Structure formats: C-alpha cells, structure tokens
C-alpha cells in the first residue's frame, strides 16, 4: 500500500464565546476524519461509516470516559500555561499525536503541543525528551521529563500501538482508503497556461510545468489540492507565456504510480 497515517488532535480554548466548545478532540486516517468528541456532546462518536460499522459500542463507551478525563486535564494544563504566560483573555491549547506507516514498511511517530497556534513542546521519542520553545515550555518540560515512565509509555504507544490501530483502521476502511481514482487533466489558456486536474483520489498528486524539457519551479504557480466535496480532489498549476519566443511547454502529473504528460501545441 502507499503511505498512510493516523493522528489525533485536541483543541482547548480558555474563554470561548457562547456556544463554542471549550474542548474538541478529532482523529484522522490520512485526510479522513474518523472520530470526534467535544465538551458539549461529551461523547466520542464516529466520523466515518466504516468506523461505526467495525467498532463495537464498548469502544465508544470506554473512550468516551477517557476523553471526559482528558478534557479536564487539558483545561488544567491550559489554565497553568496562561497563568505562567501572565495572559488575560481567550487563548488556545492544542495537541497532535500520530504515526505513519510508509510504503516501504518503515514507520514514524510524533507528538507535539501548541499554544495560540504556535509550537510549544515537541516530543523526541528517540532521545526520550521534550523540546521547549520558551521558558514556560521549559518549566513543563522539566516536570514531564521527571516522569520517565510516561515518556517510555508514549514511545511504545507511538511505535507499536498507533501502528497497530492504523493497520486495523486501514482494513476497516480499505474500500475508501486504498482505492484509486485517476485524475482528469486538461490545459487552459488564460497570459498563463493552467494545467488543471480533478476527480482524483488519493489527494496526493504532483503537477508541474516543464519548458523545453527542463523544470523551473521559480516561475510555476502551484495551486492547492482542494476537496471537491464528493470524496475526490482537484488541483492546478500555471506558468506564464513568453510573448517574444516560442517554447515547448508540457504539464506533468504524477498520481498513484502513473505519470502523465500533456504537451501543449
């Protein structure tokens, strides 16, 4: 299979406006949401049909209780940060944990935190240590690194448990996650040549322009890979035409092991 990943995010807000949750936790496999929990529902719920169908109610019940506890811990942690930063008003706290299973069979794992949307603490599971970006993070680093057992627990969870969950979810959702829908690709003139692709899955795609068989990325405008809403994606890239000299321009698209070239006449 190609590369796949599993990750869980948390978001805490210290003084949220009316209605908005104080706490949200969402899991993803690749680009696909799989799970959701927030401080309003107080329930962990599936976000993909193949999760609902393959995980018995005991799974949602157990993790609902854990998430209620993680919610409270997140509040306490954010209260501590905002006191040590001496900040008033509403501030945000975020966490991301996850792993990747690469095509070649190797793995990665990661765990990090942010305050107001900026890196705060980053875990290194090989040195078993936390990187602190400032002295408020440094205080937290010292406390967390004093609990060596919990670092070892995170290493095992990233390297072993997370990968096992990911393989399990990949099988559950294999009809979605492991399919291929090839792009439909065309070239438009608008002056710049636009190379446009739509209808493809997975979202990972490489589109570029070559001029006389050479690539110059400094003159290519790369569009974002965007969801079309039906489970497929679209993307584009453009280069500007030289009005004083002809050139052989060609759009090159790579998607899921297939390469395509559109030479423009």
């Amino acid at each position, epitope marked *: 299979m190609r590369t796949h990943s599993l990750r869980y995010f948390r978001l805490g807000v210290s003084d949220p406006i009316h209605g908005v949750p104080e706490f949200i936790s969402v899991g993803y496999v690749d680009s696909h949401p799989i799970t959701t929990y927030d401080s309003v529902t107080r329930q962990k719920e599936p976000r993909a049909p193949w999760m609902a169908e393959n995980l018995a109610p005991d799974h949602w019940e*157990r993790y609902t209780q854990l*998430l209620r*506890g*993680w919610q409270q811990m997140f509040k306490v942690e954010l209260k501590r940060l905002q006191r040590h930063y001496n900040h008033s008003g509403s501030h945000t706290y975020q966490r991301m944990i996850g792993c990747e299973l690469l095509e070649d069979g190797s793995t990665t794992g990661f765990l990090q935190y942010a305050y107001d949307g900026q890196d705060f603490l980053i875990f290194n599971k090989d040195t078993l240590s936390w990187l602190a970006v400032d002295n408020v993070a440094h205080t937290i680093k010292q406390a967390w690194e004093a609990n060596q*057992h919990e670092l070892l*627990y995170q290493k*095992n*969870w990233l390297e072993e448990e997370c990968i096992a*969950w990911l393989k399990r979810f990949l099988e559950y959702g294999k009809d979605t996650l492991q399919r291929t829908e090839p792009p439909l690709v065309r070239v438009n003139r608008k002056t710049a040549l636009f190379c446009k692709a739509h209808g493809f899955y997975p979202p990972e795609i490489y589109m570029t322009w070559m001029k006389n068989g050479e690539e110059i990325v400094q003159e290519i405008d790369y569009g974002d890979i965007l969801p079309s809403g039906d489970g497929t994606y679209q993307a584009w890239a453009s280069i500007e035409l030289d009005p004083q000299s002809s050139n052989l321009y060609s759009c090159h698209v790579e998607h899921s092991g297939v390469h395509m070239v559109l030479q423009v006449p």
Partner: antibody
Amino acid sequence: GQNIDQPTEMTATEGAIVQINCTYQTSGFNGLFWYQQHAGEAPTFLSYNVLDGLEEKGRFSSFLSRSKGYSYLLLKELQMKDSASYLCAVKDSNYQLIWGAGTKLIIKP
Amino acid sequence: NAGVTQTPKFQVLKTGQSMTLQCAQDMNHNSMYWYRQDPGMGLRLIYYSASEGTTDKGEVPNGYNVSRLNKREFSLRLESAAPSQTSVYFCASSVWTGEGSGELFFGEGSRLTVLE
C-alpha cells in the same frame, strides 16, 4: 479472550533469589505493573515496564519482553518481610487494567 | 495526607440488606475505582470514575451502583445484598487515567460477608 498468568504460589529460602513470572495475552499493550500485597493489606505499587529490558529498584528488578509477552519480578536477598502476594497487571489497547490472580511468596527462615 | 480512606473495615449483612461503602482520597487525584478481590481470581473492576462528574460500569457492575459525590469521594452501593457479594472490596485512585504509566493507590479494604 485476554489472559494474564502467574504461578499460584512459590516457596524459597531466606537470603536466596526468586523470579516470579507473568505471561500475558492481551489485545494491545500499554504497559505491565507489579504490585505487592501483604496478607490482609492493600496492594502497593512496585514497578512499571513498557519497553523491553530490565529495570532495577533496590532488591527488586522487573523485566519485560513484549515479543514474548512475558515479565518477571526478581527478588534478591530474600527476607521474611518479602512474604506477600505479588500481583501482575497489564493495560490493554483500551487502557483496561487486566489483573493476574497473584503469586503467594512463602519464605523459609 | 491520609491517602485513600475507605470504610467500613468489616461488615456482616443479611441477604437483601442495603449497604454503602465510603471512600475518600486526599491526594487531589482525578480517577477513582471500586474493585472486588476473591480467592483464585485477579481483581475485578466493579465501577470507576475517570474524572469528577462521570462514572461508568467496570467488568462486574451488576448488583452495585456508585456515586462520585465530588472530586474526593466515591461511594459504592449494594442495594440488595446477595451471598455472591461476599468479598473484599478495595477502593483505589490514580492521578489521571487513560494513560499508560500512572499507578493505583489502594484503600485498606472492606470485608463484607452476606448471609441468608
């Protein structure tokens, strides 16, 4: 069907070394605990292992092999106060703590 | 600084009698647990409380109920005692839960005997 197995009882002589084994078959693994429980008293925490290898704490060491699904608690220079039950417990993929039935350690003075 | 305080240490009950076991912890822990211990078996979780304001069934909840009264207190209720509930009951607490490495702190145990 998740199982944790450890011998019912072991008997050793004062001053010697004893190794208490615990094997586990669980759906996922988030670490292995040992607790000591004197007769008529509450269990108390002895050790936690989650990566492979041996960890020492005084006269007690605890070993773990994740691939073999096995741990031992090693007690050196046995004393009479080591007479107690020793409970092994494992956290599964759902953080459920699954308890072995305990090993009663009897020490001959 | 007392740790986990549970009561009563001993109790005899007639089948059908009601009983509440009390447990408090002064360690500012968030998670609390009620276990039963019987010969020849590992500890079995009856009910637990992952955080103040939530509780859930363990593996053997039938015949029992619990109340997480506040952050400190977690009571266990036998509404209609049965002979099968003769056991030694342990309350325990942990700083948090849903994490690998945090250990349990146990109370001294409550020995209940239920008789016809």
